[PDB]
Amino acid sequence: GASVGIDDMVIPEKKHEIISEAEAEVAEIQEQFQSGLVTAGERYNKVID
Amino acid sequence: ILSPANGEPIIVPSQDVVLGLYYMTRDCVNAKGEGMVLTGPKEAERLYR
Amino acid sequence: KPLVGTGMERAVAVDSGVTAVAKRGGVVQYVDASRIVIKVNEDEMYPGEAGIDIYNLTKYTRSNQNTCINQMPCVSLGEPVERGDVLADGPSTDLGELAL
Amino acid sequence: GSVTEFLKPRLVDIEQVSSTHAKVTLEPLERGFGHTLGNALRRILLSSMPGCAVTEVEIDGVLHEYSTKEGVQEDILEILLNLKGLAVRVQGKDEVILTLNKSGIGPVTAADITHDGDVEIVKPQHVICHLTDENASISMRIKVQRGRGYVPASTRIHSEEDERPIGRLLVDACYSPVERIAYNVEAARVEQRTDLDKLVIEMETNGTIDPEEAIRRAATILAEQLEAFVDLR
Amino acid sequence: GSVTEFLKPRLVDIEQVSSTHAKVTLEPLERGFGHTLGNALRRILLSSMPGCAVTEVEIDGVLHEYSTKEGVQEDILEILLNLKGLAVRVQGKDEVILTLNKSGIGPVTAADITHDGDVEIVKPQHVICHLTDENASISMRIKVQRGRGYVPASTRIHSEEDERPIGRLLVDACYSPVERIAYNVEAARVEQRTDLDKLVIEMETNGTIDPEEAIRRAATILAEQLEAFVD
Amino acid sequence: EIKELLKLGDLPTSGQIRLYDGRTGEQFERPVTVGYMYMLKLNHLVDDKM
C-alpha cells in the first residue's frame, strides 16, 4: 500500500539559509561589478558558479 | 528473451514488480517478531500470513 | 461541479453560448423542461411591449463531434432573476459552472 | 478438550439507529474467528443480497425516454433516474405493477403511488418529479421485480422473444439493498476467559431489508457454499 | 432464475503430487465467492486448527539457550529447530512427557523416542541431532501439548512461574498442523457468463492428517460456527 | 491552509488514512493517500476503436 503524500517530499530546513547566503554573495558580486572591479562576463561566470 | 541489438535481457520488471520485491526484501530494526528462529520459508509464510 | 476549481468556470460558462442567459430581469412566469417564459420587470419593460421573454431550450441535438447537446432549467417557478443570470445549464455545465 | 471445542457465536441485540442505519452485535467469538466471519459476511452482503428494483416504466404521453413532456420541470431521463433510486418492499411475489397519477402544481413524490396490500413504500416522500403547470396531468406505470446484483440494460435486452411496444422504457436495475457495511471486532467480557471477542456490524441500507434477515440470509448462503467443501467428493 | 438458488462447484478435482502436498481445484463459483471461501479457509487452517505440538524442552547438562554441548556438534538452537520440526499425534490426553536418551556415534532419529504407548510419531526417521564424540550421551525430556494456532515463545514468556527452574527452554509453538496453505482465484468459463471464479487451493500438511481431511475439518468448523444463523 | 481546512473537519492533517483490503480484510502496512479528485472521460471510446 505505498502512496505519495504532500509531506513525503520533505524540504531541508537548511535550504533557506543556503539561499540567503547565495543571494548575499550574488548581491556582493553585483555591487563589486558596479564598483567596476570586475567586468560583466567575469561577474556573470562567478554568479553562475 | 535477449534483445538482438545488444544481447541484454528484454524481459525485466519495470514499475510495480521491482517496488514489491524491494519492499519485501528490506530489513527493519525493531520489527515485530524479530530475533526468532524459523524452520524454513513455509514457517515464515505461515507467520506473515 | 468541480470540488476544487479556479473560479474561471463561471466566466467560461457565461461567455460561451451553451447556457441560457436572461436578457432582462424579472420573475419566472412559467418554467418547463422545454421552454421558459419570464415576465420582465416594469422598469426594464420597453414601451408598447407585452413584457415577457421566451427562451426555447435546445434538447438532444447532435453536435459536430456526434455528442448530445442538452439544456436543463436551473430555476424554479416564481424565482426572481436579474440580467446576466443563467437560466438553463448547457452541456457540461452545473448551475452556471463548467463541469467537464 | 477445551482447545478441541469452540464457543458458539450468537446474535445478542439489534440496534436501529434510524430507518436505514442499524447495528448488529455477535458474541462470543474467538481470537481470529471474528476477523474471518465479519469479513465473509461483509463480502457476501455487498453482492449476494436479494432485493426489489424497478425494471420497466410506461408513460402515456412519452414515446422514448430521450424526450420531454409538457408541464414537468425535469426530462424523462431525469424521471427515470429518480425512479431508479426508489426503494420498495414487496412480499409474496416478484412482479408488481404500480400506477401513479398526479395533476396540479407541486412536487410528485412516491406518496402519490397507489398503495397496494403487498407492496409498501419505505420512503413515501422520495421526490420523483415536479409539475409546474396547473393543467398538467401525469400518469405512469411502474414495473418492479425482485433479483440480485446489478442488471444493466444491455444484458436484459438480450431477451427479445416478445417485442416491447414503443413507450416501455427500460431502466438499469440495482437489486442490491445494502449500501454500506462496516465491521469491528473488539474485546468481549463473558465469564473469565479474558480472550473472547465480539463483533459489531454497522449496516447502511435502503430500509427494505431487516438487518437480522440479512445476517441470517448471508450465513445461510455461506453455509450452503461451504457444504461443498464439507463433502469433498 | 430464483434469487435463493446459487451456483455450486460441481467440478472438484484433487491432484496429489505427494502424500503431503495436494492441490484441490473447484469450479465454478459465484463472482467473488471464491475469494471469500479461500480467505476463510486459509485463516481457519492457519490459526484455528487444533493440533499437538511441543511446548518446552528440558535438556540435561544444558541450562541456557546460548550454552553449548560438546557431545553434539549441532548447537542448541539447531537441536530446538529439529525437535520443533517433528510432528507428534497424541490422543486421549492433552500434555505428555517423552523422555529420550541416546549414547552412540551417529544421527539421532525420532524412532529412538521412548514409546509411551499413546503418542505416535509420523516421521520416525526425522533427524534430531548429530553427536561425534564416542563417550557422549544426549538425554532430554520433551513436553508435547494439544492446543490451537501459533503461539510464539515471545508471547508465552509471560507467566514464568511454571518455568522458574533453569533448563526449560521455550520452543516455537507450531501447534497448527498446516504449512504452505495457498489459495488462488482464476477465471472460469461455463455456459454464457464467465465472471465465475475457479478456486485452486494448495496444501502441505505435516503428515499427521491428510490435507483433504484438514480442509474438510476446517469447513466443518466454519459450518459449526455458522449454524447459529441457519434457516 | 489545506491542513487547517482538513483539521476543520474530522480528518487527519497528514492527508493519509488507513484502509483495509477488500478481498482479504487484512490491515494495510502503510497509510495511503485517498481523497476526492476531478476525473474527465476522454472522447476515445473503446467501442469506436475496435
Swiss-Prot record, chain A:
Biotechnology: Co-administration of salinamide and rifampicin or salinamide and myxopyronin suppresses the emergence of resistance to both antibiotics.
Originating species: Escherichia coli (strain K12)
Superkingdom of the organism of origin: Bacteria
Coiled coil (residue ranges): none
Entry protein name: DNA-directed RNA polymerase subunit beta'
PTM comment: Acetylated on several lysine residues in the presence of glucose.
Family note: Belongs to the RNA polymerase beta' chain family.
Lineage start: Bacteria, Pseudomonadati, Pseudomonadota, Gammaproteobacteria, Enterobacterales
Subunit and interaction comment: The RNAP catalytic core consists of 2 alpha, 1 beta, 1 beta' and 1 omega subunit. When a sigma factor is associated with the core the holoenzyme is formed, which can initiate transcription. The rRNA transcription and antitermination complex (rrnTAC) consists of RNAP, NusA, NusB, NusE (rpsJ), NusG, SubB, ribosomal protein S4, DNA and precursor rRNA; S4 is more flexible than other subunits.
Role of this protein: DNA-dependent RNA polymerase (RNAP) catalyzes the transcription of DNA into RNA using the four ribonucleoside triphosphates as substrates. Resistance to the antibiotics salinamide A, salinamide B, rifampicin, streptolydigin, CBR703, myxopyronin, and lipiarmycin can result from mutations in this protein.
UniProtKB/Swiss-Prot annotation, chain C:
PTM comment text: Acetylated on several lysine residues in the presence of glucose.
Superkingdom per UniProt: Bacteria
Applied biotechnology: Co-administration of salinamide and rifampicin or salinamide and myxopyronin suppresses the emergence of resistance to both antibiotics.
Record note on quaternary structure: The RNAP catalytic core consists of 2 alpha, 1 beta, 1 beta' and 1 omega subunit. When a sigma factor is associated with the core the holoenzyme is formed, which can initiate transcription. The rRNA transcription and antitermination complex (rrnTAC) consists of RNAP, NusA, NusB, NusE (rpsJ), NusG, SubB, ribosomal protein S4, DNA and precursor rRNA; S4 is more flexible than other subunits. In pull-down experiments interacts with CedA. (Microbial infection) Interacts (via flap domain) with Escherichia phage lambda antitermination protein Q; this interaction renders bacterial RNAP resistant to transcription pausing and allows it to read through termination signals.
Reported function: DNA-dependent RNA polymerase (RNAP) catalyzes the transcription of DNA into RNA using the four ribonucleoside triphosphates as substrates.
Family: Belongs to the RNA polymerase beta chain family.
Entry protein name: DNA-directed RNA polymerase subunit beta
Origin organism lineage: Bacteria, Pseudomonadati, Pseudomonadota, Gammaproteobacteria, Enterobacterales
Name of the gene: rpoB
Stretch of the intact protein here: 697 to 796 of 1342
Curated annotation (Swiss-Prot), chain E:
Molecular functions (GO terms): DNA binding; DNA-directed RNA polymerase activity; protein dimerization activity
Gene Ontology CC entries for this record: cytoplasm; cytosol; cytosolic DNA-directed RNA polymerase complex; membrane; transcription elongation factor complex
Signal peptide per UniProt: none
Post-translational modification comment from the UniProt entry: (Microbial infection) ADP-ribosylated on both alpha subunits by the phage T4 protein ModA. ADP-ribosylated on only one of the alpha subunits by the phage T4 protein Alt.
Comment, domains: The N-terminal domain is essential for RNAP assembly and basal transcription, whereas the C-terminal domain is involved in interaction with transcriptional regulators (such as CRP) and with upstream promoter elements.
Function as written in the Swiss-Prot or TrEMBL entry: DNA-dependent RNA polymerase (RNAP) catalyzes the transcription of DNA into RNA using the four ribonucleoside triphosphates as substrates. This subunit plays an important role in subunit assembly since its dimerization is the first step in the sequential assembly of subunits to form the holoenzyme.
Annotated family: Belongs to the RNA polymerase alpha chain family.
Official protein name in the record: DNA-directed RNA polymerase subunit alpha
Natural source organism: Escherichia coli (strain K12)
The encoding gene: rpoA
